[PDB]
Amino acid sequence: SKMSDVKCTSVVLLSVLQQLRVESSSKLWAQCVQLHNDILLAKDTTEAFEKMVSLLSVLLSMQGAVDI
Amino acid sequence: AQSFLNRVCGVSAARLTPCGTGTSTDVVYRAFDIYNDKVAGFAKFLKTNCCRFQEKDEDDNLIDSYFVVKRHTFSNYQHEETIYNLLKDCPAVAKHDFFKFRIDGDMVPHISRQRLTKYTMADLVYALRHFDEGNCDTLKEILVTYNCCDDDYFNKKDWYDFVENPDILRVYANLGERVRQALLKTVQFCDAMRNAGIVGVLTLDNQDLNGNWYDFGDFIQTTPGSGVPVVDSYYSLLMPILTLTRALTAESHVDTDLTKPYIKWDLLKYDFTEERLKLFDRYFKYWDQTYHPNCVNCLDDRCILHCANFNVLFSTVFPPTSFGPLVRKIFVDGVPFVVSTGYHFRELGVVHNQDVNLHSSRLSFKELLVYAADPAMHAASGNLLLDKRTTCFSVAALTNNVAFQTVKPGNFNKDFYDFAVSKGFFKEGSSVELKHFFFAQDGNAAISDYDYYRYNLPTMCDIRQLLFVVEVVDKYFDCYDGGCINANQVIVNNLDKSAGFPFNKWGKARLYYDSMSYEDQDALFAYTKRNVIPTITQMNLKYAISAKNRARTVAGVSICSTMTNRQFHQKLLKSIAATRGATVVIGTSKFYGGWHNMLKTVYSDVENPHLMGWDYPKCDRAMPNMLRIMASLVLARKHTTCCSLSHRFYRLANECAQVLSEMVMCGGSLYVKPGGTSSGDATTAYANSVFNICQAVTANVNALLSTDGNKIADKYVRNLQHRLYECLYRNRDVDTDFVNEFYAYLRKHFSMMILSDDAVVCFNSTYASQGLVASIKNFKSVLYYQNNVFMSEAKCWTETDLTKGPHEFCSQHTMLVKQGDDYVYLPYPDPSRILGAGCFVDDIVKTDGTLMIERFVSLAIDAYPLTKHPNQEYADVFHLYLQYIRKLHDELTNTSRYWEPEFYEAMYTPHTVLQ
Amino acid sequence: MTQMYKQARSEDKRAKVTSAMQTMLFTMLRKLDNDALNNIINNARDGCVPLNIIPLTTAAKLMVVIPDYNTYKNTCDGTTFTYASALWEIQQVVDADSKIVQLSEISMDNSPNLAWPLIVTALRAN
Amino acid sequence: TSAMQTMLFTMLRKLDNDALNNIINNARDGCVPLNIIPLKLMVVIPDYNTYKNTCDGTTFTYASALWEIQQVVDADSKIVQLSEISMDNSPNLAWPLIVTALRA
Ligand SMILES: [Zn+2]
Ligand SMILES: [Zn+2]
């Protein structure tokens, strides 16, 4: 089920990104929306993971969010 | 031999290819518009009489001009010769040459007509009104020969499609000049006939694509000056392609030539009645029915349709800044205003309010409401706006900055997902999986979604055909009960909808239903019966599940629009929703046997039954205004004892100005909505049903008329087709007997089940294969020429085995199951949709638990029939949902306990119909 | 025959919404009563004018929404441009994040660094 | 909001992909991207205990792929030739290094 796990993780990750107020940046929110939508529509279980690492880089580029 | 060629050349165009000398060039099918005592229709026949030579241009290259030399009997040759010697000196008459040739021992008389194109206007009209991308060779040949495109264009993918490759509109509009010259030649010909005393019928197949006319074999000579041409079938069959090819686009240039500047119209001008009358008297001079430019002066709904159909065509010539509310400057206690005191519709012309009060005294609640909803003061005090993101007409910007709305992701229900995973769902290599989600949206989603209205193009309809289809549809809608109701009989549910703009600033619809007295509401209604109230519609982005990442929108219609539409239409809508066993099955619950009864009604008594369904691409964005007006008129036909003609017309005008060509508040700006239904109106689910029955009846009419009446073996269907053509293009009256007769034929051989935008048809497959009822290709053709969309046969299904019912209806599948020695049809959903809706919630339920359990029992109600499925994972879905609902109810702590399977079973059996 | 004459939940709820509408109308017609509108209407045949021309011929502020640079260059190039047969002077270009974009940044090499729906506010020049 | 964040992190740990675990381990060390990782990547390296573990010669191991270091700039905002990194002359190097590379 490594695809359903990825799609649910994508939903959760865009939720936390939206809570971090990134829709207050047009360009960044557009990129993240594109990544999330293509992860949800993906059919191959490796380009989904490529887009997933690309989308998680957005969250952990903000020097500190949690990462205890 | 070659002597025949030396003679047919005569004294013109000595260079002719020897393309025929016997009765040759007869291996072709040509479209004919035929009507006599044996056959009647507009169909493709096998013309085998000609001998067509083709002229070769200088330098031995072939040119599109033919000498068609036919062989005639002596009497018809003499008759045609005399009528030609009469009509000779008209410029819109192809040259003829009458001679005699010795074949074996007798001087057989021939008639050779000169310099005709290869095809005729009938061939063009048939190619565009019976479109089938499998064999569109005539259309390709025309478009190539008349320099509309080149041979390689058709290697493109979906070149015929409208919504993909919208350059086909530019490729079609290159025939517009040719079609307009054909219209002008037709008027010249009709004048030459009247001034010579020649009575006869004009048929498309007698006009080549240059514009000339021929074949004077059925005309008869009368006293000069009193001839009378008959142009009903001609003009009405031609009408749909006048707007497809934009024939009148040259009427907006300085001197009606495409090589001159545009006419700089006055900006303050809005009347255009004399221009419309000039256009009519120029192009349709002999259409002998009264044309009223301002439909206010019409006589009946049929006259309103007839003249709005002309206004749709004549309004593409005028500047788009002249349509919309007509404002005036009134005074209130001395302070000036600007308020709408009229309207200018593209379809209905100029409408003026009858109750306008210059120099007011005060503002009561009703008139405050009217003035606040009026877009005049909103668009006159806002900034000018140039939105380069759309092609739609922009009015004004009500702010100093644009608003960009975004949509959030859904809420993951991790407890349910872990429960499903522990039960064993979503395992790799399964048939049930997650395919429906909440797709997030970025800033450029509201306007990128609004820009789809570019698929709504001005389209003229075949009026002689629409004026019969509307009678058959009103036959479909005649077991109901309608009329106006007072404000104290209206029952309003969901009193927390959007109140549109600018009311959503101060509350929901509850505020304005609690502030206004019944007397105020009645006064507002009686006011709308005498005036036009243009309103503003709010457009928001919806937050819902979909399998496509497209953005779903929602509309909020003004409270002063919904409040009066309720009094107008509530009785009819209740009567439609509370009746079982009809065609339009709206408001019929699928529980307690509703699905089985619906299906057994559709199957009613069709003889060789096959099931069929279809879809409308971009239905709400592409529904034509003529058809939306026709739907509203069909709905308003219930008000014959309470509203006079003026009241019904002003209600139609309000409905148009409010839910057809409204102003839309998108972002923070005002745009002009060209057309299409509004998802925020209570009437569109029924207007869509009227539109759906209209398109189906039209497909049936075309299928019956376009079939070769000589091969129909049933002497009843032959008479039905003959009388159908008569009732359409002759017989200006309405024939109630034949309307009943055709409605009965349809009900017997083409049974429909209609909900808004969704249909299921049970049809006689034998008749459909013979061509006597509508197949799916007939729907494709009708949609192409009357909806400006291309319907792929990959979204239309067909079922030969009726024991497995419709493949899809209202997003539900059908399964034939056993319920106590009685096989019943049960509706089951998409398991992927059920599981998706279960795993992703809207954060309104993540807080309290009773709403969560309510959601989950509604899902387990919709997912019960899966237990009867043969596939095992499908049954496991319902078992999973039941286990989870038991877990939830236990966490919070017989046939009405929602935690046992017999609460759901009883929802699908008619022995317990209790709700 | 009481609830047909009178409301039900008036209770200063009818009053709130009527005063809201009243103040909205009287704050609209204060940035509206001018002489451009008088000279527009007073030249019509009977005082009635289409609404789609009122902002076009009397508005003193234009807002242009531009998606990309090959549209900026064709539409709003410079500090003054022409639209609706009038001459507009640019002021205070803004990007999609409500941040001010200087006119010295909208070129082909800096394009990717701009939130692209650009909103240009211009005033009507005489 | 830390509930949603710990949900996200437990799901990411469950996924157990090596690329995601690699970028998470770097982010926990301090090695952090400064832009969306491209499928032109610029990355902050904290110190050499983290630099030597990942960057070898010119070649960059990140997101379990390969990148060719095109330009490295220390904190002082001045180009540094990456053939000066040491293990004894390491002080004078301005140690938050922005390394910019492209995917080979
Ligand atoms: Zn009329
Ligand atoms: Zn009525």
Author numbering:
A (entry chain C): 1 to 68
B (entry chain A): 4 to 896, 911 to 932
C (entry chain B): 67 to 192
D (entry chain D): 84 to 122, 127 to 191
What does the paper say about this structure?
A key component, the RNA-dependent RNA polymerase [(RdRp), also known as nsp12], catalyzes the synthesis of viral RNA and thus plays a central role in the replication and transcription cycle of COVID-19 virus, possibly with the assistance of nsp7 and nsp8 as cofactors. Therefore, nsp12 is considered a primary target for nucleotide analog antiviral inhibitors such as remdesivir, which shows potential for the treatment of COVID-19 viral infections. The structure of the COVID-19 virus nsp12 contains a right-hand RdRp domain (residues S367 to F920) and a nidovirus-specific N-terminal extension domain (residues D60 to R249) that adopts a nidovirus RdRp-associated nucleotidyltransferase (NiRAN) architecture. The polymerase domain and NiRAN domain are connected by an interface domain (residues A250 to R365).
